[PDB]
Scaffold this active site. Sequence first.
Site, mmCIF file in Angstrom:
data_model
loop_
_atom_site.group_PDB
_atom_site.id
_atom_site.type_symbol
_atom_site.label_atom_id
_atom_site.label_comp_id
_atom_site.label_asym_id
_atom_site.label_seq_id
_atom_site.Cartn_x
_atom_site.Cartn_y
_atom_site.Cartn_z
ATOM 1 N N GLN A 135 0.868 -1.247 0.000
ATOM 2 C CA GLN A 135 0.000 0.000 0.000
ATOM 3 C C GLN A 135 0.856 1.230 0.000
ATOM 4 O O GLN A 135 1.827 1.365 0.822
ATOM 5 C CB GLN A 135 -0.874 -0.093 1.249
ATOM 6 C CG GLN A 135 -1.958 0.993 1.273
ATOM 7 C CD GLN A 135 -3.126 0.618 0.423
ATOM 8 O OE1 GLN A 135 -3.562 -0.534 0.387
ATOM 9 N NE2 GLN A 135 -3.700 1.654 -0.283
ATOM 10 N N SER A 143 4.254 -5.733 3.811
ATOM 11 C CA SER A 143 2.855 -5.863 4.238
ATOM 12 C C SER A 143 2.074 -6.643 3.165
ATOM 13 O O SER A 143 2.239 -7.867 3.058
ATOM 14 C CB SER A 143 2.232 -4.543 4.618
ATOM 15 O OG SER A 143 0.920 -4.769 5.122
ATOM 16 N N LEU A 144 1.247 -5.996 2.333
ATOM 17 C CA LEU A 144 0.635 -6.702 1.201
ATOM 18 C C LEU A 144 1.737 -7.417 0.363
ATOM 19 O O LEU A 144 1.516 -8.520 -0.177
ATOM 20 C CB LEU A 144 -0.142 -5.644 0.383
ATOM 21 C CG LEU A 144 -0.820 -6.174 -0.910
ATOM 22 C CD1 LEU A 144 0.175 -6.328 -2.124
ATOM 23 C CD2 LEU A 144 -1.669 -7.438 -0.666
ATOM 24 N N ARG A 180 -8.313 -9.903 2.893
ATOM 25 C CA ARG A 180 -7.451 -9.175 3.877
ATOM 26 C C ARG A 180 -7.776 -7.666 3.827
ATOM 27 O O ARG A 180 -8.019 -7.057 4.853
ATOM 28 C CB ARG A 180 -5.997 -9.361 3.438
ATOM 29 C CG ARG A 180 -4.999 -8.825 4.442
ATOM 30 C CD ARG A 180 -3.593 -9.174 3.983
ATOM 31 N NE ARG A 180 -2.541 -8.662 4.840
ATOM 32 C CZ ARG A 180 -1.966 -7.480 4.687
ATOM 33 N NH1 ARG A 180 -2.350 -6.643 3.731
ATOM 34 N NH2 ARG A 180 -0.955 -7.130 5.455
ATOM 35 N N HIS A 194 -1.370 -2.786 11.374
ATOM 36 C CA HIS A 194 -0.096 -3.259 11.969
ATOM 37 C C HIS A 194 0.095 -2.768 13.408
ATOM 38 O O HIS A 194 1.214 -2.642 13.894
ATOM 39 C CB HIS A 194 1.136 -2.901 11.077
ATOM 40 C CG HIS A 194 1.091 -3.641 9.810
ATOM 41 N ND1 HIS A 194 1.250 -5.030 9.770
ATOM 42 C CD2 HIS A 194 0.786 -3.235 8.566
ATOM 43 C CE1 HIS A 194 1.154 -5.406 8.488
ATOM 44 N NE2 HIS A 194 0.844 -4.348 7.757
ATOM 45 N N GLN A 229 1.088 -11.199 11.141
ATOM 46 C CA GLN A 229 1.525 -10.011 10.391
ATOM 47 C C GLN A 229 0.471 -8.883 10.541
ATOM 48 O O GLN A 229 0.838 -7.691 10.601
ATOM 49 C CB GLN A 229 1.672 -10.363 8.915
ATOM 50 C CG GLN A 229 2.421 -9.264 8.111
ATOM 51 C CD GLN A 229 1.925 -9.191 6.664
ATOM 52 O OE1 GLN A 229 0.729 -9.266 6.394
ATOM 53 N NE2 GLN A 229 2.842 -9.052 5.748
#
Length: 313
Positions: free
Chosen positions: A19, A97-98, A122, A207, A256
């Site tokens: 992102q 992340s992604l 997600r 997160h 995560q």
Amino acid sequence: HSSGLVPRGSHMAIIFPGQGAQKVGMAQDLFNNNDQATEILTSAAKTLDFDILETMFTDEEGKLGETENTQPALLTHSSALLAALKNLNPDFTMGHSLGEYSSLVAADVLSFEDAVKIVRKRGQLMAQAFPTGVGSMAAVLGLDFDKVDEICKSLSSDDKIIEPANINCPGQIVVSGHKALIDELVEKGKSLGAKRVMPLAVSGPFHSSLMKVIEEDFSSYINQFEWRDAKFPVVQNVNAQGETDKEVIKSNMVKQLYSPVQFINSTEWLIDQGVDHFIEIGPGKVLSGLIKKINRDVKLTSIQTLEDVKGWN
Ligand SMILES: [Ca+2]
């Protein structure tokens, strides 16, 4: 070389952005111009319940930056590039992340069609986790991690929390948590010595430990797919170490969600194994910028377009 002593080095890692790296027009140059990339783009189009390709290429609804859409868009762009590249011989991979899902497709942990469904869920779970206004994120620029963590411990109070979330490079730490505390940091950041505290366009406190609210729903969905062992190590965001086990990787994808992205330590772990060339594959060159601030001696390649694919091939 001729001494018979081969130095630790010459290992290569392919890495994938998350992102923040999207852009309207992403992958439009691949579509119908490369058979392998087009197979991926058309797979995503046939799988998803919204017009992913319109959203990537022209975004007439201005929704490309809403994470339920951006996540499958980024996976699709990175995987389409990856499918077009010849003799990419990575020793390791990681993604932000992604981006870790793009690493899972690259290492054959997950097939692209399973991963695109997984990251769409997600994104929808993250987007819906908290009502507007409850949680947010901000980038703290110019401060050492220890000072950012102190600040976070100071502001965390009255049952509200703010925590380091994305540990990106020296001088760039994104923090996450209750919006009231994110906004207090934004207001006071300059007075506390940050070069700049930028509130971010996010729908929730990603997160941070608050994202435990979506752990069960996400764990339940991901059980609908078959996870495989990795063909080369995926350096995971939760623990910054190479993993190949299917059950360890899967469990770390659920952790995560609510754990900080250890990008600095993951970069350092890879360099300590002899990675001296990182190849970023996706739109933008944001991870290449972060790695340059971490280690100025390693080689950085960015693959963004069909022309970059042709040049590599
Ligand atoms: Ca995850």
